[model samples]
Target chain A: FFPIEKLRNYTQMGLIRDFAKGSAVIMPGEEITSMIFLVEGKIKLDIIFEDGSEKLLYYAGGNSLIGKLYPTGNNIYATAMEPTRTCWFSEKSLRTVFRTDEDMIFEIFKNYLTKVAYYARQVPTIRILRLFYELCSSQGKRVGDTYEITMPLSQKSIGEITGVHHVTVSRVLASLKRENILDKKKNKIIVYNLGELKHLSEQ
Target chain B: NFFPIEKLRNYTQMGLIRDFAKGSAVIMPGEEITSMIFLVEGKIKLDIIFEDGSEKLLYYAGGNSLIGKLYPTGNNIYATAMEPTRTCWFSEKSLRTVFRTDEDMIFEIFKNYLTKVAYYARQVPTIRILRLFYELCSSQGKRVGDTYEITMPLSQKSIGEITGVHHVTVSRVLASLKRENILDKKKNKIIVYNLGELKHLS
Candidate 1:
């Protein structure tokens, strides 16, 4: 329903590349400066965490504009879910494309709109998940199949961050404990499934 | 997901159903318009145009999405259908009918406004922490070898105290910096591995 080829001008200036199923579209820690336009097939983008864990960011379909002019050091990894086609636009070629086609500017705007919508939907869960991630990252220690953040705090403090009812922290923690995902104590937040926290945080 | 098709369908007894062809500007920028447009079926893109003529993307809407407002918007919003689209429009009169029809939407738009409020509340703390980090790096940081090291000692309590943000926010910001390897707070020294990234965040 959408056309990525702006008069085929990119065919001359940009690199047309194809990836087989399970091939790498982007690798970790690579200096990726090209603005990638997915022409065909699906690419799974994931955020590679510090401890070699991965969170599936999203599935990039055709017309999904990706990457920026420079690295933000996000440790993003991409792989082809199916046979895929792409056009890579480097800074020089991107400028040329911009000069030749003004529509590409709006096309990129469409790409950003998708990102904004996704982030918007994820807002409700962000505070809760952010608090957990913060606690884990700051004072977390690995203990068996779980990680615990050792700190003593009250629901009053949690209400400041999470905006929940006085008993809501106890209420939500009790629910998570029942679900076998997370737990809380007087001085520790024991997270059994870190992925679950991030998963429920997503749209 | 943003389209309130099911909720809007409850009020279909009023309002108007409209069609937009491909390449049509559903809502042109700078138009003195005030209506609630809900998608019946179609794709539309929304962009916010600034005073300097630079445009930032707001979001895209598909079937079941809401793309209009009843009150005046401060910023200029341009909406264009990406393809042939069908939408339902709600005027103030129709909204009155909706309210009379035992409204759920009355409670719902409360969500829209409150969602906006909640989003900004979370964001305020985040930016305050960013401003704190940015200030420390630019003001107190000295380039020692490859990294920028702050001259003073700092902690989560200190950041929280000065920025008036929650200590949890301070930790959250610090945690992100640590995870990204952008900065670190040692026992005595605060080492900034990348001030450019910090600058961007601020």
Candidate 2:
């Protein structure tokens, strides 16, 4: 099954099979491919430190490409936390295609790079706060009477992704919970008051 | 090093270029940039004069280096070089044409420009590192049960000029850092022991 209309003037090759969840698709320390377009599901991109701490760099959803827009000579790891389906081509092949058809390629790559640069410019500390803000905002789907984030996330996982201590994360979340800005129900977090949470984050 | 006048003369794209003795200003501020300067010979210390009457030593341009005028909203130079210098000047119109049209020219300039940007970003953090280092390697004295000391040899004017702070304010912060046990002065150099702690403040 394929959606030919989604990507104009590009032929579908076929499906990629047997890729497991929590497996590295484009491992760090490897050279760049053209880019990978996610067809389905989500992937978590991160950079791991020497002390076993990890900083979550980005999360690629459907129609998003992984890796840098510009040439960077460093290895930043990417792995799929959930099972994902993706399409990729080598740099030479993509360049050849672009040479024949310039307009669509240019539009796709330009928008992609702009998004990539937006995330790249921010420091790790600021990114964590923005991530929490996102979880509280649009991701908050209404379940019956209350708004909630559907994703299963842990405080330790949040700390690992943010390079913050687990205890520090717990304390911050507790403070937010106390202010009624956030709710800690088992492992999941729900934002009862987004306006209050936003105000707290600003400070 | 010998002058590359023949090579400079061979290129019709370039304009008039000449050599000068020591202590001569190569590119002055508030002047229109006619061309970019390429170092053909000798060393030149590049320095910027701030609005607050403080000066900063940007870098020293040497052999094979090009000094492009950077700064001010209008057509004006951002800095001046202090030393004997020999440079080949290229007109802005010609250079811009070559930059877009020539592949080699793009590689030469763009690579260096990216390096320069990254260098400036790193410099913002490194200056704090140097400031912290200055606090250590210097003498310490007691003041009401706290160590109140000063950085030796480096004048308040020089410190302010280098770091873009006021001479008086530089003195005040140095005194404060000393009081907080974040700085030490010994002999002529300052060594920072609490670099980890100071970085957290930054």
Candidate 3:
């Protein structure tokens, strides 16, 4: 989920904290003073518009970086999607660690670049499909040409990730079901054809 | 506009040079990326195309910038050179080896990548606000004391694409702004009387 191995040596320097679901980890206009690494549960990153509408940027789960490593004037928000636990590292301490451990700094840089590459290369639909495929491949059991997704992901949550209305997500799922591309069983999505789904993502 | 050239000399010496013609593709969708790219000259546009065939411009990269899609995943976005471009390409193995031996180079690369991430994050909102402001300035600007009048002859469709709004919504918003005295059209140009107030809308 994240490059936690790079920070293994500094585990003692981090403070572990627990957050209830719906709790704000960081808010717009707040100065960033520390970095957060999710050790449990999920969090959503969002941008609040002037009209008070919120746009879901992405989700970070266990072993993921939760805040900007560097300070910026931009107003972005982070909130826990579920009961979450994180390891918090102060800015001062993190900087000192990076200065002392060049290997850790390089590894962290590679990790950040990997994330930037993901965002740059993927569109919304592709991003959603890729997330589903990743989870499916990791935990799914194959049965008669279909792979069952073990993750509990609601259509609304999928909509949040894809930056579309929930209604649109329903429509997309319905279309896919009709095309024999996707199916749902007991609240979990099943991919009937992984190749086709991958092809759809490519376009 | 970026880091000093001397600091990047070691990197360029270790990379393979490639040149692209204007409008040529630096990278295509669905292609596996074999190397990390750093643009030495010219500009490129990264675009994502939807199923409906509509395309969105993600961002533009110019000189002294690292190209995106360096990770091992197959690229889904198109990278087209906007002008004749020169780039230095380094294989993943080579880059990792260099990182192990050269501490200063790795630090500089790390700093640059962090800055790039911050830049892309900031661009997400800035691009939206900039498009809205540009449209407003073009369509409804009037000359007054310390105010400059401007004309926007751009079509509503163009405005829709730029702001990522529906065409009908663009029309409705333009009408609403006009009714509020924030916009007026005279001789095929927009007249915005109060520039300060108009800026607040952005």
Top-TM-score candidate index: 3
Note the Cα lDDT for every prediction shown.
0.66, 0.50, 0.64
Question: Worst lDDT window (10 residues) for model 3 chain B?
Answer: B122-131
Across residues A90-188, which tens digit of lDDT does each residue of candidate 3 receive? 765665676677556546766876766655534245545554554455446798878885445667445433355456667777877899987855556
The TM-scores, chain A only, for the candidates as listed are 0.56, 0.50, 0.56
Docking class of 3: incorrect
**Residue A178, model 2, lDDT:** 83
Clashes of each: 2, 10, 4
| Model 1 CA deviation exceeding 4 Å by range | A1-12, A117-121, A124-203, B1-202
Which candidate has the top score in lDDT? 1
True contacts recovered per prediction: 0.00, 0.00, 0.13
Name the better of 1 and 2 by lDDT: 1
TM-score of each: 0.35, 0.35, 0.51
lDDT of 1 by residue, A144-182 (tens): 989986656554455444544445566766777898877
Interface alpha-carbon RMSD, every candidate: 14.6, 17.1, 14.6
lDDT of candidate 3 over B117-164, digit per residue (tens):
555554442233233444335433445666556543545554444344
Residue pairs in candidate 2 whose N, alpha carbon or C atoms collide under 3 angstroms = B135-B184, B136-B190, B136-B191, B137-B186, B137-B191, B138-B184, B138-B185, B138-B186, B139-B185, B139-B186
> Candidate 2: deviation at residue A13, Å?
23
Give model 2's TM-score versus the native structure. 0.35
DockQ of candidate 1, scored on C-alphas against the true complex (2 decimals): 0.03
User: Candidate 1's residue-wise lDDT over B96-190, tens digit each?
Assistant: 67755654455454334324322322332565566555654664468988789865555677455544577776778889888998888888778
